[PDB]
Structure formats: structure tokens, C-alpha cells
Amino acid sequence: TAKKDENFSEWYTQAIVRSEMIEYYDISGCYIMRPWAFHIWEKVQRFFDDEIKKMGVENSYFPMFVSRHKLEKVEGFSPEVAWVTHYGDSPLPEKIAIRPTSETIMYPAYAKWIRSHRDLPLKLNQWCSVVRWEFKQPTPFLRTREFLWQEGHTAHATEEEAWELVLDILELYRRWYEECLAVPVIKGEKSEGEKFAGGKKTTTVEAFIPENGRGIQAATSHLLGTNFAKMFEIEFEDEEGHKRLVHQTSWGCTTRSLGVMIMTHGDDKGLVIPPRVASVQVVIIPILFKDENTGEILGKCRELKTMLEKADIRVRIDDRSNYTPGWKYNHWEVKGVPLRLELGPKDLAKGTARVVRRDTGEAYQISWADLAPKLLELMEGIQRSLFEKAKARLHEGIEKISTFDEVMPALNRKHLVLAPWCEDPESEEQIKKETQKLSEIQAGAMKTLCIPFDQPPMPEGTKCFYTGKPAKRWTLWGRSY
Amino acid sequence: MVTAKKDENFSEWYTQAIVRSEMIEYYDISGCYIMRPWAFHIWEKVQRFFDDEIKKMGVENSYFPMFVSRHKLEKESPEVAWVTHYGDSPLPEKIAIRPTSETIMYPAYAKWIRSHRDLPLKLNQWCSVVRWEFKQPTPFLRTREFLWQEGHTAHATEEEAWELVLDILELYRRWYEECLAVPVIKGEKSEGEKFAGGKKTTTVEAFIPENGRGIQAATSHLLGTNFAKMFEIEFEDEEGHKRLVHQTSWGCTTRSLGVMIMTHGDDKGLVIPPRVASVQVVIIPILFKDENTGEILGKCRELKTMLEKADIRVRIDDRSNYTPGWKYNHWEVKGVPLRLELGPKDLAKGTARVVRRDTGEAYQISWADLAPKLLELMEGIQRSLFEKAKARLHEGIEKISTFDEVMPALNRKHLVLAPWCEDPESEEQIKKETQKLSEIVMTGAMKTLCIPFDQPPMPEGTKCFYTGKPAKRWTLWGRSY
Numbered sequence A: 001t002a003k004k005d006e007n008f009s010e011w012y013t014q015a016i017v018r019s020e021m022i023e024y025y026d027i028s029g030c031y032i033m034r035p036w037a038f039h040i041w042e043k044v045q046r047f048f049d050d051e052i053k054k055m056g057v058e059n060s061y062f063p064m065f066v067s068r069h070k071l072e073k074v075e076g077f078s079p080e081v082a083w084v085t086h087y088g089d090s091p092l093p094e095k096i097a098i099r100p101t102s103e104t105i106m107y108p109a110y111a112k113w114i115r116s117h118r119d120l121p122l123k124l125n126q127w128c129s130v131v132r133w134e135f136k137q138p139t140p141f142l143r144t145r146e147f148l149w150q151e152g153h154t155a156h157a158t159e160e161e162a163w164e165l166v167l168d169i170l171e172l173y174r175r176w177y178e179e180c181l182a183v184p185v186i187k188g189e190k191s192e193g194e195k196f197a198g199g200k201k202t203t204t205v206e207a208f209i210p211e212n213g214r215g216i217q218a219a220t221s222h223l224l225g226t227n228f229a230k231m232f233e234i235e236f237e238d239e240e241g242h243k244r245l246v247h248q249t250s251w252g253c254t255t256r257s258l259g260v261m262i263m264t265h266g267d268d269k270g271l272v273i274p275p276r277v278a279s280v281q282v283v284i285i286p287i288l289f290k291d292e293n294t295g296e297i298l299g300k301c302r303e304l305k306t307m308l309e310k311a312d313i314r315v316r317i318d319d320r321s322n323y324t325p326g327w328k329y330n331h332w333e334v335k336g337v338p339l340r341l342e343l344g345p346k347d348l349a350k351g352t353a354r355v356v357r358r359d360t361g362e363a364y365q366i367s368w369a370d371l372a373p374k375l376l377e378l379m380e381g382i383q384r385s386l387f388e389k390a391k392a393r394l395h396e397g398i399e400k401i402s403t404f405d406e407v408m409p410a411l412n413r414k415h416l417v418l419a420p421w422c423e424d425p426e427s428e429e430q431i432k433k434e435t436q437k438l439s440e441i442q443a444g445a446m447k448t449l450c451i452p453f454d455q456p457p458m459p460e461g462t463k464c465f466y467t468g469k470p471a472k473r474w475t476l477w478g479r480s481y
Numbered sequence B: 001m002v003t004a005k006k007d008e009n010f011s012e013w014y015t016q017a018i019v020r021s022e023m024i025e026y027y028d029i030s031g032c033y034i035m036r037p038w039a040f041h042i043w044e045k046v047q048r049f050f051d052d053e054i055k056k057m058g059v060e061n062s063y064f065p066m067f068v069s070r071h072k073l074e075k076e077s078p079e080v081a082w083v084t085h086y087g088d089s090p091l092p093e094k095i096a097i098r099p100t101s102e103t104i105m106y107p108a109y110a111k112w113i114r115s116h117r118d119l120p121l122k123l124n125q126w127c128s129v130v131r132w133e134f135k136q137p138t139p140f141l142r143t144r145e146f147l148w149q150e151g152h153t154a155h156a157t158e159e160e161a162w163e164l165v166l167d168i169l170e171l172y173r174r175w176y177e178e179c180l181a182v183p184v185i186k187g188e189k190s191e192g193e194k195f196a197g198g199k200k201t202t203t204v205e206a207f208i209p210e211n212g213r214g215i216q217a218a219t220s221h222l223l224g225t226n227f228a229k230m231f232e233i234e235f236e237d238e239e240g241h242k243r244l245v246h247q248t249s250w251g252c253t254t255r256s257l258g259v260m261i262m263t264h265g266d267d268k269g270l271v272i273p274p275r276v277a278s279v280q281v282v283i284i285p286i287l288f289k290d291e292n293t294g295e296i297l298g299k300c301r302e303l304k305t306m307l308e309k310a311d312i313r314v315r316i317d318d319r320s321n322y323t324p325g326w327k328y329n330h331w332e333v334k335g336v337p338l339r340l341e342l343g344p345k346d347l348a349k350g351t352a353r354v355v356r357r358d359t360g361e362a363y364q365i366s367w368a369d370l371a372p373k374l375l376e377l378m379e380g381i382q383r384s385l386f387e388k389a390k391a392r393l394h395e396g397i398e399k400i401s402t403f404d405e406v407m408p409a410l411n412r413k414h415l416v417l418a419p420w421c422e423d424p425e426s427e428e429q430i431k432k433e434t435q436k437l438s439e440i441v442m443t444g445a446m447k448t449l450c451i452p453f454d455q456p457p458m459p460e461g462t463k464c465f466y467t468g469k470p471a472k473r474w475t476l477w478g479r480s481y
């Protein structure tokens, strides 16, 4: 009912409801991931895990609790600590905390495990859930009490090796978004005001939501440097016998990616799932009505399913008798299955099937023998087309500007701005506050999204679009999630 | 290197084996442990096995919240861990961390299921849960937080549910026997030992000879219609009458790793069955006094490529900061099944020296014969580990007929197979009497482990070994985890 361009958050809520991706729950901010959503997580998890295993990153599991004494005697997703005080009706002798971060457990372990240069590099990953206690206005995948992620943490003898890993991981995050989810992203560096607190440098991939003009951070990969090694005394004796601090990285990516995929590819009809991650790629809809199944149509449906599955196509036959074919068409459209295969009496009488693409609605009459190759072709086409259209929208959403008087216009067009910036942090705070004020008066704030790796030329003497001081680099700004 | 002997101080041996093989890091909070990458590799092998198999059965993965409300939890709790505070302030309502997810998932099941067309519903989750007991913990075997999978299905009939119960139990037998080379006994739990709220619990039970204790390896419950009544999970059948669903739930945990360690470990540390070894063959180049250094490394990489063509999992330990003898000890204590040594002598002869971990036997193998001979050796090692463990299991069970045989058999560190009337009060009586007699860290009580599927014949008039009433079935008892 709600149109994506007119009432975006209503559209998002409804499209997620009707798609059966999630279910509600009696504790606020929590959402059940049903298979239609969880399978997408499984796909990107397998891709990213295969790739980091090639880099020698090994998975691990740390306890979810920290002792009161370890906390009393690192910035997390919650400012305060959640305490477990009882088991059943019995008070614990000492209350324990749900860990605010994994770093508080992992880094003391790293300080024990690393003693010598022979022990480096150390590369660990953990797939797990994460809890937040101070979410506001929850919404599936974007603002939740609990989400899923992977977090990698590595330690190296040199900063050069650590940085190399940071960038390799950022490239894997680009591939996670662009090759699996068909979502284009922009590689860049965070501002001093937006990077990880105690780290040296934060790199990020950023996406864009045209319907509200907002940038959204897709994933991050931090050069932590030696600051945490000094805090946690993670030292190694080098080849010459001198004690040195390790150079660390950490990197994470969450189920927020599913939300970004949803928002990127949905239309007024509902979700559109990229074929590479869809739980079902082709739904076979028999043109049947209740109490009339002779076996002719369902038998051919089953033969077609077998044939498609031998080409590794994920197929479901919706043979539920109590629904009309048109009901099923709309049901699977709203889920965003990328292809629908229609088989009725006429198709049986002709040796063909009618196949409809979800992204464009185009229909193809395809002989049974041709189904498996043609479908593979179509799915790649759909995947590619989903990405390129999104990429086009991304580039139409960014305006390259020179001066501050160009900001509020572009923000009113629901656009990001790429502007020469002196990178002075106080100026980012000033720009946020005054774009926020301006927005208020006009009826919010605009902040740095990233400093892109891809830098256009900077003419000699170009001045900062805000302070008028010498500009350092081109910086991508916008309203933000 | 391990120095405690498995048959002398079993607990010290076990701690040494799991720490020196880099599987476990002990932790500030008792009963919680850091699971290091070497352990996580084995977990990932059995996880992949079981996940692939349940996908063939149509079970889909999902993710439900880690928290559960007081009212859902108690519609149904001394192991449940309560979050009661955030910072210094009480939560308005305490919430529980999941010890299991029946009460989390089944309100959603009742919402989702309306028609016989909605069945069977088959969901699974891979996650961690928390059971905060104060009895003695053991890394892997009995912990306060652990990784597991939990599957939950709903069916139109009891018979279909029971088929799935038994199919999953067979997958747990394969998990232990086929992957981990650990023999298990299928049975049903006694009325007193079955899952609370369920109808019938089936189990696979393992045995640890060094301390004489049985342990439940995995469990598969027929929940029946009991939880369907609790949560109003109903469907309209084909005739239009409302019926309760018939449910199953099943789980298996990282306990499986503990049982593998204890089953196959020896005085030198771990022994990993080839089917779950992430490194099946470690290649050790013998570099001494610069003799053929480049040639040896090249031939090692060639041999790695050749072996990977046969799907053998190979690692070259060409780390320069360790001697060959160090690498021998390192990969032995970590339990790599096969070690391949290549030095100048081996290069000259066109062979390699291969040492199998379980027996220490050495082989001189031509390069051309390496892949078929190593495949044969690995299947021989796998089968031999299983057969030796199965022999120890058989020797650890005494078949008895009267209660005065119980304490001697328990004192030989054995289980007992006894005819039992299956009256539930007699199990409490037997636990208490055997505890008292044990006196004259873990409990000395003998409880039922399972009523085996495999039933010896019950001669007419056989008396229950404890009550003297007519025996019903043969029952396996022991001290237990």
C-alpha cells in the first residue's frame, strides 16, 4: 500500500512485514529472523568466511560474560553494563556483566598469547550476536536490541602489514555488498571525529539511500595502531630482543547489510532479492484450483524442479490449494523472489513455461528443454541489472560543490555533497550544528560520511568549502543514519 | 608437551591436553572458557556435516532472540540467568538469557501455523545458550555457556514427528561415530530423566572409561502435543477440524569435542580423527645446515598440490623460527593425524617419511604412491580409533541381575546393564542409596543413562534388580556427567 518514494519508513515496515523476513517478539527491539532473511545472512556469511579463511583468519568463540572484578580493576554498543545477578531465584555470589565489548576479553588473551615475533601475525574472527541496550525507535535490521555480525581482530609486528590487512578486509566488504547484495558502496576514510575512538585510522564502505537522501555506513575496518597494545600490554620481543608493541586491526559487518539491501532494491510492490542470496531463486506456481489436482500439472512441476536443481537453482513449488494463482503471484512478488515460473494447462499443452522477472516484470515463454540455461542467464542479468541501476542512482545522488552556499540546496534535493575540506575537526562539529539549525529554521544535521579513496584532482590553492582555509581532500558529506 | 599420564591423573591430563594443544584458554568466570581456533576447526567440521544433512531433510536455519520474558519463560527455572540491572538502575522487568528456545520460538510457531498446508514446519538455529549451574564444570563437557544447534519441528501427526526424532538421532550417531570416531548407545531416557514438558526423549550415550562416567552425547525429543497445548499451536486439518501439532526438538553441543578428546587422547596429547582434522597431513621440511633448502621447499609445495588433488587437507609448516623437532612435537600435541617429513635424504630417494599419530608407525612412501597410500592410512586411522573406543565401551559395561552387584561394578569404573521395572520412584531411591554407599568431586550416585533401543530378551519372570518387581526392560545405569 505505502509507496517507497512517498512514505519510505512506512514502505520499509510494510515490505518487511509482508515478505515474512522477520517476526515480532515480546521484548522490545528484538526481531526473529525467519529463513527468508536468515538465508541471506547464511550466504554472505559463507562468502566472507571463505575469503577470510584464505587470509589465514581463524574463527573462535569468547564467553559473553565479564566479571565485576575485571571491569572494576573500550567503547561498546552501550554506555553502561547489563548485569546478571541471579540464577533462578538464587542471587549469584558476585554479579556478572554481559561483556560491553569483545576487546575487554580478547585483548588480555592476546597479551598472554603473544610473546615473540614468532607469534605474529595473530588473526582471529568471531561470528556472534551483539546486544544494545539504548536503541531508539527500533526497526528491523537498522535499530535493534540484538543483531548478528562478525568481528575480526588481528595483531601484527608492523603497521604496514596491519594496514595491508585493513584494506584487504575493506575490499572483502566491498565484495560482500557489491557482488552478493548488488549494493554499490564507496570506500573511504572516516573523519577524525567519526573514526573509532582509540584507533589510528578507520576505513569504511558507505552506501546511499536515495528515498531519504541519507548515507549509511555499510561496514568498517580499523587500523587500531598501538594504542590498545599499550593499554593491554600486548608486547612482543623482536628479532633483536627488544620489546615492541603489536599493531592491531579490527573489523566488523552486521545484519544491517540486509536492511541496506532491502532499501536499495525494493520497489512499490515489495522486496526484490538479488538471485545470489535469495533463499528461493525460482518459484514454480502451478495454475491450479482446489480439489482439481489430476497430477498432470504438479507432475511436470516436479520434473521441472528436479531439472532446475541439477543446475544448482534453488526452487520451490507453491502447490498450496487454498490460494488462487494470482494470490501466489502477489505473495511471491512481495517476498521478492527473483523469478516466477508459471505452469498451467496451456503451458503443458505447448511444452513451454511462462517466466517472469521480479525486477522489471518482463515475461518469457521458454521451452522446457531451455529452462535451465535461460534461467541461469536471467538470474545473472537480474543480479547485474540490480547493481548497475543502484550504482546509477548512487552517482546521481552526489553533487560536487565548492562553497557552503551550495550545501542546503543539495541537501534539499536529498543528495550528498562532495566538497573540498580542510579536515579540521572543530569545523565538522560547526558544520553539523549549523546545517542542523538551518534545517530547523527551514521547516537534520549533515556530517562527514567518508573521505573517499577515489580522490578527484585538487587544484592548487582550493579552499575549504566551509572555513575558507586551504582544502586538504575531497570529503563526502550528507544527512546520515 | 603433555606430561601427565592419562591413566594416572585423568583431570590433570585433560587440562594439559586441552591447554597445550591450544584448544582452550581458561577464564576468570568459572565454567566459561575461551574456545581457541584449533578447537573451533573441529566444531566447524561437525557443524558443516550436520547442517548439510538437516538441509537435505528440509530444515532451514533461522535466528531467534537470546532474551526471553518472564511470562513466556514461566508459562512453561534455577539454571536461567536473569538480567536485572543496567548500570546502577534495575530494569523495569527482568529478562532471562536463553537456556533453550522452546518458549522463545513457539509463540511464533502458534502465529505461523494455521493449516495442514503449513506443516511440517522445520527450523534450526546455531547459537550459544547459558545454563548457570554450580556443580563442577568441565571444559567442553559441562559448561555454563556453550555452542549448539537446536532444531524444532512441528508435524500434522505423531508418527511423522517420531520419524523425524529418530532420523535426527541417527544423524547424532553419525556425528559421533562417523565424524568423531566415538561410539554411542541409542536409547530412551527414563521418565525422570526426560526433557521437562516432553513426551519421550531419545538419546545417544557415551562413556569415559578413565572415570567410569556415562555422558549424554546428544538428545532428540518427541515433545508430542504438550508444548502445542501450552502455546496453542493448532492447525485446521483437511476435514476442517482444529488439531494440535506434534512437535520435536533436538540439540547437540561442543560437548562432542570434549568427548572426542577424552576418547582418543593419549599421553602425548590430542589425537584428531582424520574426518574432522582441519590439517590431515602436516609437511615438515627438514632444513639443517643449508642443505638443499630451496629444493626441499619446492618439493614440499609440489607434494601439497598433489595431495590436495585428492582432497587431502595439507599444511606445510615452513615456519623458519622453529626447529623440525619443535614442529614434530607441536603437531603431535595438537593431534594432526599424519606427519610427512622431507629432508635431503628423502629428496634423494624420491620418497617421504610419514608417521601416523595414533600409533607412531612410520612409513617410507614413494611420491607417486603418496595420495592413495595416505587416503588408505587416514581411513585406517579413523576406523582403528573407532574400533578401539568401541572395544573399551563394551568392556566398560557389566550386565547384572541383582543390586548387590552394583557397587563392585561401579568401583571397577563400569556401567551396569540391569533389568528394571521402570518405576520412577525407584530411580530416586537408587541414586540416593548408591550415593550413600559411594561414601562408605562429582556425585557418586548412579542414575539411568538410557533404556537402550537394543534390548536383550527379557526371560519370563525376570525380577527388577532393585525392587524385585517384574522387570520391564534392560536399562543402562552409571555414574554420570
Ligand SMILES: Cc1cc(N2CC[C@@](C#N)(C3CC3)C2=O)cc(NC(=O)Cc2ccccc2)n1
Binding pocket: B031, B131, B132, B133, B134, B135, B136, B137, B138, B140, B141, B142, B143, B144, B146, B148, B216, B217, B218, B219, B251, B252, B253, B254, B255
Ligand atoms: C556443553 C554442555 C552440554 C550440556 N548438555 C545438557 C544436555 C545436552 C545433551 N545431549 C543438551 C541438549 C543439548 C547437552 O549437551 C550441558 C552443559 N551444561 C549444563 O548443563 C550446565 C552446567 C554447568 C556446570 C555444571 C553442571 C551443569 N554443557
Ligand code: PRO
Binding pocket: B099, B100, B101, B102, B149, B150, B151, B195, B219, B221, B249, B250, B251, B252
Ligand atoms: O535443551 C534441550 O534438550 C532441547 C533440545 C534442543 C532444544 N531444547
Ligand SMILES: [Cl-]
Binding pocket: A042, A043, A046
Ligand atoms: Cl550457504
Ligand SMILES: [Cl-]
Binding pocket: A163, A201, A223
Ligand atoms: Cl597508515
Ligand SMILES: [Cl-]
Binding pocket: A215, A216, A217, A480, A481
Ligand atoms: Cl550510518
Ligand SMILES: [Cl-]
Binding pocket: B044, B045, B048
Ligand atoms: Cl568445514
